[PDB]
Amino acid sequence: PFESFLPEVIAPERKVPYNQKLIWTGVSLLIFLILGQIPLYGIVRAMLASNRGTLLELGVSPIITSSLIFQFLQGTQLLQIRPESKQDRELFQIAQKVCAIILILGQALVVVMTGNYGAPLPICLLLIFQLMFASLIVMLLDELLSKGYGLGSGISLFIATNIAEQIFWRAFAPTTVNSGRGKEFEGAVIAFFHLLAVRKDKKRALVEAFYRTNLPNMFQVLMTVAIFLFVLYLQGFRYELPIRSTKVRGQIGIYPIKLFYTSNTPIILQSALTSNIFLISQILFQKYPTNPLIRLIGVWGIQMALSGLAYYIQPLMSLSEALLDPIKTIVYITFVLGSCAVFSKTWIEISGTSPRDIAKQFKDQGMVINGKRETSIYRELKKIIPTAAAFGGATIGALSVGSDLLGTLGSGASILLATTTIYGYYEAAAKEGGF
Amino acid sequence: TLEYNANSKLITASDAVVALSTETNIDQINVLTTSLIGETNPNFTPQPNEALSKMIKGLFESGMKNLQQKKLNEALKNVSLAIEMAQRKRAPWEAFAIQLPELHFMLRSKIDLCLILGKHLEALQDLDFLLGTGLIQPDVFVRKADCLLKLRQWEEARATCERGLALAPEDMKLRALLIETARNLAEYNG
Amino acid sequence: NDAHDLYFQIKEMSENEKIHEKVLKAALLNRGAESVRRSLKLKELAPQINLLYKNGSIGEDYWKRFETEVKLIELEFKDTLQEAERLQPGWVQLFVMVCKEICFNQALSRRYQSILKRKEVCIKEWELKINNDGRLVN
Amino acid sequence: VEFVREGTQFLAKCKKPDLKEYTKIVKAVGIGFIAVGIIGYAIKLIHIPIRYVIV
Amino acid sequence: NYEYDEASETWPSFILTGLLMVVGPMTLLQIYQFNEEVFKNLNEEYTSDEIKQFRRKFNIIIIVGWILVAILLQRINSNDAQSTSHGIALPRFLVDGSASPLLVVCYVALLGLILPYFVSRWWARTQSYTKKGIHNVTASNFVSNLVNYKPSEIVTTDLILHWLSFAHEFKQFFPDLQPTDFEKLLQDHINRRDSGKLNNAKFRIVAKCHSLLHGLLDIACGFRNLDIALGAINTFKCIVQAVPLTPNCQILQLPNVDKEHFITKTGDIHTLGKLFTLEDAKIGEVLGIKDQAKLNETLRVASHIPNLKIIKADFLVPGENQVTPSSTPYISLKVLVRSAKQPLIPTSLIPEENLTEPQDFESQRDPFAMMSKQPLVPYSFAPFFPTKRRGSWCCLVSSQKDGKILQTPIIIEKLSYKNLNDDKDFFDKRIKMDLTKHEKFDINDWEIGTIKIPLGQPAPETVGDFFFRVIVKSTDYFTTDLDITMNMKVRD
Amino acid sequence: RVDPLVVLFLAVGFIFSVVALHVISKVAGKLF
């Protein structure tokens, strides 16, 4: 705790209307995307939304890292914050910024001192200041969107934007590549209509542009659209249990229990874990060629692991590998389902959304079940929340596996994350009431 | 602009046309000056006067005596003159919690006499003033509804009768007044 | 729309024409009563202003202007009390209550004086045919 | 085997969206998604020749 | 390094697909693509020509895209047509021609001048307005007038017009006129007087005064003042009907009457039912029009404007059967929209079914869903108001302990006027033959609208009777409004 | 402390300065 005079945007004293909020989101988003397209001057990434060689090389990594560290130290119960005061909250919010800025300082210094830009002073200081200004701008923009001028957070918004941009680029890329046979578009609809116009052989060009074993095609577009619509339908699933108040009588409402109970993190943790264990198996098999235990735990060849645990846990790309070995397919399915289920259970247990915590919240607020007693709220939540969370996690896993096997334009996790971010905005606009 | 008299010490705005708030301020300051001229002590106390109160009481009793003699014409003049003197020759720095109740006590008698005589509009105006100045009693709404019915205003009469019943619903006169109002309004529309 | 400027005008007139001494005290009492009335008005209107502002039906600058008037009224009352002490020594502990009473008294007097003009507007609105003696002749 | 039973029980007790509500849902979400996607696509496309000419 | 199109072989296809991706869906969507109103016809039959002229005065993209697609496809069809070679589809002169600095100067212009200036203009425009829909200066003037408003001064129509004459939106329309000019035009409009040359401004300001009066009413309810709100509603009625507020006004709002005859001849008729008390020919003889074909119009207008009447009024709280301290109840009104020609039907004839509330969780969670299923109100009969307006009922509640408004006014628009249709004409007042025992009289055919108002404030923590006063006035006619009191029996 | 319009103005100024520096360097290399 200390006194700091740092640039911070003040929250609006009154509620911002929906139209102005939408306009501010749009303009700040345009600024964020334009900032990621400009290269530096003196010069001679997929998950954290960053690109090399531009003013957005650092991106939102300092903000996300500071937020993660603060959430972790809060979960370990080391800050001892009390919601009874409106000063320690501001202290936490300024701690956010004072750690983010020094992290930017460190990352910019290390990248400018070790990066491939070159050891030779005015150019060096200018390149440092460029990244400094870019990072302060993006942090200030996220703070602005989070203060109330935007529909929601900035990090999730920008992640969804990059997801949608990659999806649209996988289909409408005007870039061409000429490899022996001729020039072909790297987009799906583009090359589709191109071959439909120039080839003048419909029966052949149709199947040639619909399969495209080498490049994205129209079949992948149809598959990703179908999965998109299916996920959209799977978002309205919810259990509304009837609830009533006891302190202030006459307040009748419902408590919704959505299907996708978690915030889509457990699948991310599962993917990170399996990627780490796959790379570790690869490294260890590279270090030890032959061993009674290393040959059993994993073998790598033509890279791709084969006849090993890393071979069993690796994801399926297309239907050929699916019909090849049903044992590997079924064990992979069972593994990715069980892991996601237990991860969802652990996440609802750790994130304070346990049925015990919900029962305590009801007891504090005074809310009770409509047609049940008050000494049965926890016993009823125990019969609802765990099963709902587990089944939601299993469904998320099934959607991810289906997207990975059908070979859509993007990973299913990205699609569900973007749809969740947008559905949050839609539900907020519907509940508040606006055009 | 504004002119200042020499002998009378009254301030008057010599402008061709003057605003309303400015004129009210001019009159207030002139009243204060005329009061300070009469009041001798430099450190005047909020304690009210006594001789003025005696004159007011004497005028009020002389007006009330005409009720025993049953002269409702000169009694109204006497009570109106008493109220006028109480409103005019009384210093504004006198006690408010003592100047207001005497005004109310005289105004109630004036209202009763004005209603008994046959003047209804002045009675309604005085009733509305006494109600808006901070006195709410069932003895006021009855006369208000009676007057509004006497001058053929049924909507306001019904509203006032309902507001009176919303405070003392145990009245036996307010209910008859409401019944008469409902009958008159049903004939007024049907 | 105030009597604050009128007191200064009276002071400038006295500085030249040698007018009486009691008129300045009267104008001082008047400005003090007006300041007390405005302070009470603001104190009783602040919650409604804040409610309208929170409801988002008044704007953004009017709230700041209102909060500014809150302290300008206090500054004006402080200046008035300082001028009162300058005009008469040891006349502060009584000036406050005198103004507090003359405020209500002048408000009541204006409210009562308004009835003579209020009596004719209802006549014009309801088309009464009132002869002499205030009776109705239909 | 109780897992699937409780799952289908929860599903039967759930509240599936009807056609009229799902229509507005998909309309709003598709409008938002297309709006952000065209913005991303245009921003990524326009800055290629600009980056060539400038640098 | 990229390889741009140097022989015009790839960018035509890219432009063609980019254009089809837009024209196609437009073509698809283009190929793809309850309340009786009896005044919609008779309004244009009495409107003056000077207002008709004012109201009158004050796809090709698909075709051009299709012809462009045809041109592009013809151009492509007329064309002749190991390591990787990446390339772009954009043309070569676009980066390497003589117009290379042109693109960057246009881009920097669009980024530095067009975007910030337009954003700032939009921001200053959306900031100068209030959430209600009026300018900030107008609301500031309203508040500044209401705060230094002497309670001794009575509110009239002239005072509210004087307040309206200072609206900042009136200066933006015509920066030449003054507030006194606006007051004169409004007085000429209300008194049905001609301005001579500024009629196009008078009509515009009259049409704009609507939202101004609604904002003034909102602010007056915010300051907890009832007389100003009543004056606002009365002035809105007077403006919409173009008539000065008089005791005998429900008959002067009619389309074709003569004041110099009606006022001097009769002196006892003041309402519409009292007018309907006389026969069909005596009404014409009194109103002095003596034209049957023209008397039919006024007789059809006077029997089709809505009058209200209460059937059941009480406090309701969702999920309980009584009112408890610190509970959040609402007001439920069971009104009967009737005309001045129908007699009074007893409350006992109501079958008690339409007065009850359904006892279900989905119905008690949001009790306004059943109210929001009522049809809209028909168009109003305002031959002098410039635009076309629908009816509106402003319901506002006050307290009875002091007489102060305690919440913002609610404006309802959904209501069923089925009881005003011409099918139920047998139920007349002049028959006096007990039409309740009629062969066509069916209590199940008369529809009973409902009105629900959220209270916005909880019940007091005490236990006892607390009286309130709800006021439901019209906004277009001078009909019989609702002025009733109700007390909440807080019992715990 | 900082208004949203200030954030937008500063961001556009930063971008404009970067692109201006780039184009100045480009035209300097082209001419000299």
Swiss-Prot record, chain A:
One GO term describing the cellular component: endoplasmic reticulum
Query: Where is the protein found, in the record's own terms?
Result: Endoplasmic reticulum membrane
Q: Which InterPro entries match?
A: SecY/SEC61-alpha (IPR002208), SecY_CS (IPR030659), SecY_dom_sf (IPR023201), Translocon_Sec61/SecY_plug_dom (IPR019561)
Keyword list, A-Z: Endoplasmic reticulum, Membrane, Protein transport, Translocation, Transmembrane, Transmembrane helix, Transport
Q: Which residues lie on this side of the membrane: Lumenal?
A: 199-214, 286-328, 402-404
For the keyword Transmembrane, the answer is: yes
Question: Transmembrane segments in this chain: where?
Answer: 22-44, 54-73, 98-119, 121-141, 187-198, 215-234, 265-285, 329-348, 384-401, 405-426
* Effect the entry attributes to changing R373E: Severe growth defect; lowers SRP-dependent and SRP-independent translocation
Outcome of mutating R373D: Severe growth defect; lowers SRP-dependent translocation
The protein's matches in SUPFAM superfamilies, at most eight in alphabetical order, are given as: Preprotein translocase SecY subunit
Q: What is the effect of changing K372 to D/E/P?
A: Severe growth defect
Altering R249 to D/G/P/Q/Y: what's the impact? Severe growth defect
Sorted alphabetically, the Gene Ontology BP terms of this entry are:
ERAD pathway; misfolded protein transport; post-translational protein targeting to membrane, translocation; retrograde protein transport, ER to cytosol; SRP-dependent cotranslational protein targeting to membrane, translocation
Is Electron transport among the key words of this record?
no
Membrane topology, as annotated: Multi-pass membrane protein
Give one Pfam family, short name only.
SecY
For molecular function, the Gene Ontology terms on record are: peptide transmembrane transporter activity; protein transmembrane transporter activity; protein-transporting ATPase activity; ribosome binding; signal sequence binding
Cytoplasmic side stretches: 1-21, 74-97, 142-186, 235-264, 349-383
What miscellaneous comment appears in this entry? Present with 24800 molecules/cell in log phase SD medium.
Which protein family is it in? Belongs to the SecY/SEC61-alpha family.
Q: What is this protein called?
A: Protein transport protein SEC61
UniProtKB/Swiss-Prot annotation, chain D:
Extracellular compartment spans: 51-55
Major location category of this protein: endoplasmic reticulum
Which GO BP terms, alphabetically?
post-translational protein targeting to membrane, translocation; SRP-dependent cotranslational protein targeting to membrane; SRP-dependent cotranslational protein targeting to membrane, translocation
Q: Name one GO cellular component term.
A: Ssh1 translocon complex
For this UniProt record, give its keywords in alphabetical order, as a comma-separated list.
Endoplasmic reticulum, Membrane, Protein transport, Translocation, Transmembrane, Transmembrane helix, Transport
Identify its membrane topology class.
Single-pass membrane protein
Q: Which domain of life is it from?
A: Eukaryota
According to its UniProt record, where is this protein located? Endoplasmic reticulum membrane
Which parts pass through the membrane? 22-50
- Which molecular-function annotation in GO is an example for this chain? structural molecule activity
Protein family per UniProt: Belongs to the SecE/SEC61-gamma family.
Subunit composition and interactions:
Component of the heterotrimeric Sec61 complex, which is composed of SSH1, SBH1 and SSS1. Presumably three to four Sec61 heterotrimers assemble into an oligomeric ring with a central aqueous pore. In cotranslational ER import, the pore diameter varies from 9-15 A in a ribosome-free resting state to 40-60 A in a functional state when associated with the ribosome. The Sec61 complex is part of a channel-forming translocon complex whose composition seem to change dependent upon different functional states.
Instruction: Name it.
Output: Protein transport protein SSS1
Q: Which organism is this entry from?
A: Saccharomyces cerevisiae (strain ATCC 204508 / S288c) (Baker's yeast)
- Gene behind this protein: SSS1
Swiss-Prot record, chain E:
Where the sequence repeats fall, as residue ranges, is 341-351, 373-383
State which ranges are Cytoplasmic (membrane side): 120-492
Q: PTM details?
A: Phosphotylated by casein kinase II.
InterPro entries listed in its UniProt record = DnaJ_domain, DnaJ_domain_CS, Ig_E-set, J_dom_sf, Sec63-dom
- Name the domain of life: Eukaryota
Task: Print the miscellaneous field.
Answer: Present with 17700 molecules/cell in log phase SD medium.
**Name of the protein:** Protein translocation protein SEC63
Organism source for this protein?
A: Saccharomyces cerevisiae (strain ATCC 204508 / S288c)
- Taxonomic lineage per UniProt? Eukaryota, Fungi, Dikarya, Ascomycota, Saccharomycotina
Name the encoding gene, please. Answer: SEC63
UniProtKB/Swiss-Prot annotation, chain F:
Give the residue spans that cross the bilayer. Answer: 4-24
Compartments, record wording: Endoplasmic reticulum membrane
Q: Family assignment?
A: Belongs to the SEC61-beta family.
This chain's function reads: Part of the Sec61 complex, which is the major component of a channel-forming translocon complex that mediates protein translocation across the endoplasmic reticulum (ER). The functional states of the translocon complex include co- and post-translational ER import, cotranslational membrane protein integration and retrograde transport of misfolded proteins out of the ER. In the cotranslational pathway, ribosomes synthesizing presecretory proteins are targeted to the translocon by the cytosolic signal recognition particle (SRP) and its ER-localized receptor.
Known partners and oligomeric status: Component of the heterotrimeric Sec61 complex, which is composed of SSH1, SBH1 and SSS1. Presumably three to four Sec61 heterotrimers assemble into an oligomeric ring with a central aqueous pore. In cotranslational ER import, the pore diameter varies from 9-15 A in a ribosome-free resting state to 40-60 A in a functional state when associated with the ribosome. The Sec61 complex is part of a channel-forming translocon complex whose composition seem to change dependent upon different functional states.
Protein name per Swiss-Prot or TrEMBL: Protein transport protein SBH1
Q: Which gene encodes it?
A: SBH1
